[PDB]
Amino acid sequence: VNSFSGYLKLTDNVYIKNADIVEEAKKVKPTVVVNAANVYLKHGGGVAGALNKATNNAMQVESDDYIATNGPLKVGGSCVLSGHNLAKHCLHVVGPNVNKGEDIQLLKSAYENFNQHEVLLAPLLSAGIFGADPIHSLRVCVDTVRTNVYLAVFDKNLYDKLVSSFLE
Ligand SMILES: Cc1ccc2cc(C(=O)O)[nH]c2c1
């Protein structure tokens, strides 16, 4: 469990790797994988779609049941559902979608949810279609998360920009 390999330590508690978060979950067997969720837990693309596809749609079926029963999440909020074949748990975290006019200050609230778990495999939040600057998202992660977070960044050019941003 939690067999993280080849990470670069950026701070006392934040680590980073140029890797596919699905292949990392399969290798590492983490206690927790973080999903970059939306408030209706509709896993239609990006990390959410990739994680759901790796679970053979189990995650979407679970999530549909959760939302029908319990209603939508709030921006900045989270829920813990099954990790299926990827992890013990999936922490579904909703970062703000600034492309849709949501407030970037809620990225802090989103990352604060990581402090309820000793160690996490995670993507950067509010990246991709959510429209935040990835360098800013890494900074909020570093400033907010105090538990151990292993970040997986798929794109090499972005990984390099993030690491360079951070150590040069
Ligand atoms: C699929 C999977 C991956 C990691 C873990 C870790 C646990 C545990 O601590 O009980 N269960 C898992 C299941």
How far apart are alpha carbons 135 and 137 in whole angstroms?
6
Nearest atom within ligand 1 for CA of residue 25: 3
| Assigned token pair, 69 | 């029963």
How far apart are alpha carbons 138 and 136 in whole angstroms?
5
Nearest to 107 by CA among 135, 75, 147: 75
Residue 78, judged by CB atoms within 10 A of its CB (0-12, 13-18, 19+), counts as buried
Residue among 4, 24, 31, 82 to mutate when testing ligand 1 (max atoms within 8 A of CB)? 31
Q: What three-state secondary structure class fits 96?
A: coil
Residue 28 CA to ligand 1 centre (angstroms): 10
Beta bridge partners of 41: none
Packing angle of the helix pair 156-167, 134-144 (nearest 10 deg): 50
- Residue spans of the domains in the chain: they are 1-168
Packing angle of the helix pair 46-54, 21-28 (nearest 10 deg): 40
In degrees and rounded to multiples of 5, residue 115 shows phi and psi of: -70, -5
Query: Contact at 8 Å (CB) between 34 and 126?
Result: no
Name every residue whose Cβ is closer than 8 Å to that of residue 25 and which is 6 or more positions away in sequence.
33, 51, 54, 83, 86, 87, 121
Query: Contact at 8 Å (CB) between 32 and 87?
Result: yes
Nearest to 75 by CA among 49, 36, 17: 36
Residue 2 CA to ligand 1 centre (angstroms): 9
Name every residue whose Cβ is closer than 8 Å to that of residue 51 and which is 6 or more positions away in sequence.
21, 22, 25, 33, 35, 43, 59, 86, 90
List C-alpha distances in Å: 34 to 59, 113, 147, 166.
Answer: 13, 10, 13, 22
Pairing mode, if any, of strands 89-94 and 78-82?
antiparallel
| Assigned token pair, 133 | 């600057």
Place of tokens 């360098």: 135
Q: Please, which experimental method was used? A: X-ray
